DNA sequence: AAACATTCGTTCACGTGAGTTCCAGTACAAGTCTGGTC
């Protein structure tokens, strides 16, 4: 972002779907359950920028969580 | 001759080692879900 501001736009990197136990996935779902929004290809959100791979449901970055990927 | 102390074989309680059953931790293998491209 411009100096002294929070990030506004995001660029997709990759899907990850392994490395979490069932309980961790349940807790993550409960945390982010309220903030999921349906994804419409015709009116994509401004904050998230995607290529050919698009999600079924998108969550605004302000309410999401950081994940470590190996 | 009578009273008191000592000794002996017995008795009970409590502690420790070996055998047996049951359950938790560990290991390994297979199944299931996922990711990426061409």
């Amino acid at each position: 972002p411009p100096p002294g501001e929070k990030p506004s736009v995001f660029h997709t990197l990759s899907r990850v779907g392994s490395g979490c136990t069932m309980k961790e996935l349940y807790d993550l779902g409960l945390k982010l359950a309220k903030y999921w929004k349906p994804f419409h290809r015709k009116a994509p959100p401004s904050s998230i920028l995607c290529g050919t791979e698009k999600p079924e449901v998108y969550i605004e970055p302000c309410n999401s969580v950081i994940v470590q990927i190996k």
Side-chain angles (χ1 to χ4, degrees):
Chain A
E5 275 215 319
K6 305 232 173 272
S8 320
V9 202
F10 279 81
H11 291 46
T12 58
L13 188 64
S14 146
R15 304 158 65 168
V16 55
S18 151
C20 280
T21 58
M22 292 278 256
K23 297 180 177 179
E24 259 289 5
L25 268 171
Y26 209 81
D27 203 350
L28 202 72
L30 268 162
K31 261 187 68 50
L32 306 176
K34 331 211 196 147
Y35 305 118
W36 284 126
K37 277 165 155 42
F39 192 87
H40 298 309
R41 198 178 250 106
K42 290 282 191 63
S46 174
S47 147
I48 303 163
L49 270 49
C50 302
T52 317
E53 193 73 51
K54 322 218 175 236
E56 293 202 28
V57 295
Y58 84 88
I59 170 162
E60 285 265 70
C62 318
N63 323 329
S64 194
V65 294
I66 280 279
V67 163
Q68 246 200 354
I69 306 285
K70 167 179 226 180

